[PDB]
C-alpha cells in the first residue's frame, strides 16, 4: 500500500523534526530573563474616546502618521478619525455591512475592507472630485475575508475562510500568488517589518511562516489547543506572538523554530481576540472576552497591567508606529486611546 | 477659541458627518432583520421567490414594515466564527423539507436528511448567541409529503412513531419532534408554518410572527415584563 508507506514516511519525518526541535532547546526564555528587572505596574489612562459608530466594531488600523485611524463597524461604515482632535475625517458607506477586517495603506492613499461578502474592497482616499471612491474589488476567495494587509499601493495580502491566503496586484485585480497548506480557517495575518514574510494563524491551531516572493510555506508552528484568533510580529521580525481561544498567548521564535514563552492566568478562561507589541517589544498587549485588555511583560510572562473601560468584548487593538498610544475597539461601539 | 480657521472648518465637517451618521442609524433601527437558515436546500429558494458568492441580502416591504433577509448559504466555513455577527437579528427563519425523511445526504449514506436538519436546528436553537431570539420554522413541500407518506412509512426516520400513516399525525409528529429540541422554552418561541411551493400567505405569517417579536420587545422596554 503506497498510501500507508507515505503516511509512515510523514510520521517519521514529523518525529525527526520534533527530535531536532528538542535538541535545539538547551534552555528556556524564563531561565535567561530571570535576572531582568521587572517592568512594574503599567497604568495607562484613557485620553480619547471615539464616538459615532452605532454597532459592534470589528476592526481598526493605525495610520503610518500615528494620527489617523480607520475603524469598521457592522453599521456598514468605515470611519477615518483624527485621533488628536477626535474629528471625523471621513465616513465611508460600505456596499456590504458584514465587515470583519480593515486596513490602511502605508502611503495613506488607500483603505481596504471586507468580510462575509468574500470580497476585498480598495478605496481611494485622495480624488479630484473630493469624495472617497471604490478603487478596486478583489474577488476570488470562496470563504469570508478575515484579514487584509497592504504591502504597497499596488500589492495587498488577504486571508480567508477558504483555508488559503492570497497576494494580489491591485492594478489588474488578479490573484498573483495563492498560499495553501492550512486545513482550517485562516483568521489572522501579520507582515514582517521588511515585508518579505507572512505569519498566518488558523483554526487548525497552527501558525505558518510564508515567503511572499516564492509562495511556499517556510515553517509551521503548533502548540495551541484551539483556534488561533490573533497573531503579531515582534518588532525585529525574528519572533511572533499568537492569541487563542484556549486563553493563552504564545511566543514563537523563527530561527529556533520553537515556542519560547506562554502567557496565561488561572483567572483567565476566555478567548483572546487580539494581540500587539509595543515599540521595544517588551510589552505584549492582548484583548480578551473578559471585556478588557491585559498588558503582559513579554520577557517575564508576568501580568503588568490591565485596560478596563469597555462594557463588551474587546475586539481590536493597535499600537502606533512611534509607540505613543494604544487604541482599543469593542462591541460596545467605542474606541479608546490609552497613554 | 484657540482654534485656527481651518480647525473650526474641520470641526464643522466632523459635525456634519455626525448628523449623517445619526440619520443613517435612525433609518437602520426601524427595519426587521431576518436570518435565513436551511439544511442543504429545502425550500429556501422557493421561500425567497414567494416573498419577493457570499451573504445574499434581500429587501422587501410589507404593510409599512421593512424586511431585510440574509441568506448565508454558499458559506461553507466554520459557522462558529461568523454566527455571532447575527447576534442582534430580529428573527431566524429556518426551512426544513418534509419530504426529506427517507432520503439520504448523498455525501454520507447512513444519515437521513431529516436527522441532519434536526441536528442543525438543535445547534442553532440552543446556540449561546441566539438565547432570546425567535425562530420561524417553515416545513416545506407538504404536497410532496402527501404523495409519499401513504406509501413510505414515517417509521423509516422515526422508529418510535406509533401513529397512523396519514399526513395529519405524521406532520404533527414532525412538528412536535422539532419543537421538542427547544431547551429554552421560557425565553424564545418557535412559530411553525406548513407551506408549499405555491402559497401566498407565507409573508403574512412572517409579518404576524415579527409583530409578536416586536410586541414582546416593547413589553420588555416598557417595563410590563
Amino acid at each position: 500500500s503506497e498510501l500507508d508507506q507515505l503516511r509512515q514516511e510523514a510520521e517519521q519525518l514529523k518525529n525527526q523534526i520534533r527530535d531536532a526541535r528538542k535538541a535545539c532547546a538547551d534552555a528556556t526564555l524564563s531561565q535567561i530573563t530571570n535576572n531582568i528587572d521587572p517592568v512594574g505596574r503599567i497604568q495607562m489612562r484613557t485620553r480619547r474616546t471615539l464616538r459615532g459608530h452605532l454597532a459592534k466594531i470589528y476592526a481598526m488600523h493605525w495610520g503610518t502618521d500615528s494620527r489617523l485611524l480607520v475603524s469598521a463597524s457592522q453599521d456598514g461604515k468605515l470611519i477615518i478619525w483624527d485621533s488628536y482632535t477626535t474629528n471625523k475625517v471621513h465616513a465611508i458607506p460600505l456596499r456590504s455591512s458584514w465587515v470583519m477586517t480593515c486596513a490602511y495603506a502605508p502611503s495613506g492613499n488607500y483603505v481596504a475592507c471586507g468580510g462575509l461578502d468574500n470580497i476585498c474592497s480598495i478605496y481611494n482616499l485622495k480624488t479630484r472630485e473630493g469624495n472617497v471612491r471604490v478603487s478596486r474589488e478583489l474577488a476570488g476567495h470562496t470563504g469570508y475575508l478575515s484579514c487584509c494587509r497592504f504591502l504597497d499601493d499596488n500589492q495587498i495580502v488577504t486571508s480567508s475562510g477558504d483555508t488559503t491566503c492570497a497576494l494580489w496586484d491591485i492594478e489588474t485585480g488578479q490573484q498573483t500568488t495563492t498560499f495553501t497548506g492550512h486545513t482550517g480557517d485562516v483568521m489572522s495575518l501579520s507582515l514582517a517589518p521588511d515585508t518579505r514574510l507572512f505569519v498566518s494563524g488558523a483554526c487548525d491551531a497552527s501558525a505558518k511562516l510564508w515567503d511572499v516572493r516564492e509562495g511556499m510555506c517556510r515553517q509551521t508552528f503548533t502548540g495551541h489547543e484551539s483556534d488561533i484568533n490573533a497573531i503579531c510580529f515582534f518588532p525585529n521580525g525574528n519572533a511572533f506572538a499568537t492569541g487563542s481561544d484556549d486563553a493563552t498567548c504564545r511566543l514563537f521564535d523563527l530561527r529556533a523554530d520553537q515556542e519560547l514563552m506562554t502567557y496565561s492566568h488561572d483567572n483567565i478562561i476566555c478567548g483572546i481576540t487580539s494581540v500587539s507589541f509595543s515599540k521595544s517589544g517588551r510589552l505584549l498587549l492582548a484583548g480578551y472576552d473578559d471585556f478588557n485588555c491585559n498588558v503582559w511583560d513579554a520577557l517575564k510572562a508576568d501580568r503588568a497591567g490591565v485596560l478596563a473601560g469597555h462594557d463588551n468584548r474587546v475586539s481590536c487593538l493597535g499600537v502606533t508606529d512611534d509607540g505613543m498610544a494604544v487604541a482599543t475597539g469593542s462591541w460596545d461601539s467605542f474606541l479608546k486611546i490609552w497613554n | 477659541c484657540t482654534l485656527s480657521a481651518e480647525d473650526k472648518a474641520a470641526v464643522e465637517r466632523s459635525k456634519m458627518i455626525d448628523r449623517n451618521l445619526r440619520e443613517d442609524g435612525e433609518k437602520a433601527a426601524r427595519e426587521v432583520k431576518l436570518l435565513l437558515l436551511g439544511a442543504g436546500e429545502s425550500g429556501k429558494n422557493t421561500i425567497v421567490k414567494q416573498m419577493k458568492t457570499g451573504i445574499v441580502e434581500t429587501h422587501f416591504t410589507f404593510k409599512d414594515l421593512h424586511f431585510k433577509m440574509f441568506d448565508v448559504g454558499a458559506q461553507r466555513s466554520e459557522r462558529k466564527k461568523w454566527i455571532h455577527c447575527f447576534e442582534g437579528v430580529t428573527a431566524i427563519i429556518f426551512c426544513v423539507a418534509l419530504s426529506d425523511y427517507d432520503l439520504v445526504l448523498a455525501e454520507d449514506e447512513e444519515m437521513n436528511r431529516m436527522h441532519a436538519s434536526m441536528k442543525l436546528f438543535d445547534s442553532i436553537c440552543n446556540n449561546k448567541w441566539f438565547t432570546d431570539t425567535s425562530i420561524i420554522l417553515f416545513l416545506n413541500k407538504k404536497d410532496l409529503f402527501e404523495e409519499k407518506i401513504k406509501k413510505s412509512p414515517l417509521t423509516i426516520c422515526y422508529p418510535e412513531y406509533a401513529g397512523s400513516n396519514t399526513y395529519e399525525e405524521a406532520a404533527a409528529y414532525i412538528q412536535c419532534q422539532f419543537e421538542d429540541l427547544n431547551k429554552r422554552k421560557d425565553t424564545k418561541e418557535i412559530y411553525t408554518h406548513f407551506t408549499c411551493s405555491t402559497d401566498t400567505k407565507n409573508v403574512q405569517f412572517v409579518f404576524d410572527a415579527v409583530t409578536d417579536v416586536i410586541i414582546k420587545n416593547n413589553l420588555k422596554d416598557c417595563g410590563l415584563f
Partner: single-chain antibody, 234 residues
C-alpha cells in the same frame, strides 16, 4: 473634470444690483466650501465672501459687508453672489474658488475662469511682498519673499501660508498650500520654506511657463489677505 463656469458679469450703472452665478461640474459641490475672490484692473487679489459646506458659516470682507450676499444651491450645484449698491471700486474680475477643510486637505486648489463686472463712471494681517518685479533667465533659481504683519505659526504647528501663480490671461493656480507643502500636479522644482513672519518660495531650473505673477496669502484668520504680487519677466 473639475469645472467652474461663471456668468452674470457685465456693464452696470452705479447703485444698481447684479447677481453673479458659478455653475459647478465634475466634483461633489456640497462637500466643498466656496469663496469669491476679486481682481481689480490694478491686479491685486482681494478676498470677498465665504460660504461653508452646509451653509453654516458665512464671512464677508469689510468693504463689501452689508451690500453683498453669498448663497449656494447644492442640488443645482450653483454658487450665487448678490451685489447691491454697486460702487466704482467694485469693478473687478470675480473668481469662484473651491476649498475643502479637513486634516491634510488642500484648500484653494481650484479657481474658476472669472467674470468681468464694470461699473460706469486695524487688526487685519498685512502681507508684504517687497519686490514688484524680477527679471529672470531660464535655468536659474529664483527666490520670492513674503513678509507678514504677525507670525503665521499657530499653536498646532501649522504655518498658514499659501502660494499662488497667475499666468498671463489665466486664473490663479495653487502651488504651495501650507508652508513647504507641495500641491498636486505641481513640479518638484517649486519649494517653500520660512519661519514665523518670514517666507520664501524657491524655483529651481526655471522654465518659460513659470512666467507670471506670484501671490502669497494667509489663512490664519478671516479676512483672508493676499500679497501685492511679484512679477517674473523674460
Amino acid at each position: 473634470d473639475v469645472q467652474l463656469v461663471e456668468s452674470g458679469g457685465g456693464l452696470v450703472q452705479p447703485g444698481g444690483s447684479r447677481k453673479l452665478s458659478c455653475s459647478a461640474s465634475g466634483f461633489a459641490f456640497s462637500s466643498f466650501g466656496m469663496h469669491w475672490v476679486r481682481q481689480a484692473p490694478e491686479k491685486g487679489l482681494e478676498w470677498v465672501a465665504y460660504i461653508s459646506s452646509g451653509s453654516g458659516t458665512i464671512y464677508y470682507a469689510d468693504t463689501v459687508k452689508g451690500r453683498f450676499t453669498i448663497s449656494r444651491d447644492d442640488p443645482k450645484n450653483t454658487l450665487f453672489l448678490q451685489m447691491t449698491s454697486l460702487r466704482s471700486e467694485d469693478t473687478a474680475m470675480y473668481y469662484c474658488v473651491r476649498s475643502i477643510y479637513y486634516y491634510g486637505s488642500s484648500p484653494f486648489d481650484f479657481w474658476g475662469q472669472g467674470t468681468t463686472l464694470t461699473v460706469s463712471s486695524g487688526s487685519d494681517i498685512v502681507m508684504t511682498q517687497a519686490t514688484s518685479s524680477v527679471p529672470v533667465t531660464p535655468g536659474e533659481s529664483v527666490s520670492i519673499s513674503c513678509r507678514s504683519s504677525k507670525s503665521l505659526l499657530h499653536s498646532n504647528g501649522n504655518t498658514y501660508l499659501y502660494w499662488f501663480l497667475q499666468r498671463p490671461g489665466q486664473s490663479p493656480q495653487l502651488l504651495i498650500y501650507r508652508m513647504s507643502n507641495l500641491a498636486s500636479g505641481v513640479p518638484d522644482r517649486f519649494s517653500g520654506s520660512g519661519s514665523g513672519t518670514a517666507f520664501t518660495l524657491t524655483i529651481s531650473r526655471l522654465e518659460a511657463e513659470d512666467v507670471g505673477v506670484y501671490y502669497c496669502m494667509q489663512h490664519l484668520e478671516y479676512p483672508l489677505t493676499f500679497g501685492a504680487g511679484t512679477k517674473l519677466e523674460l
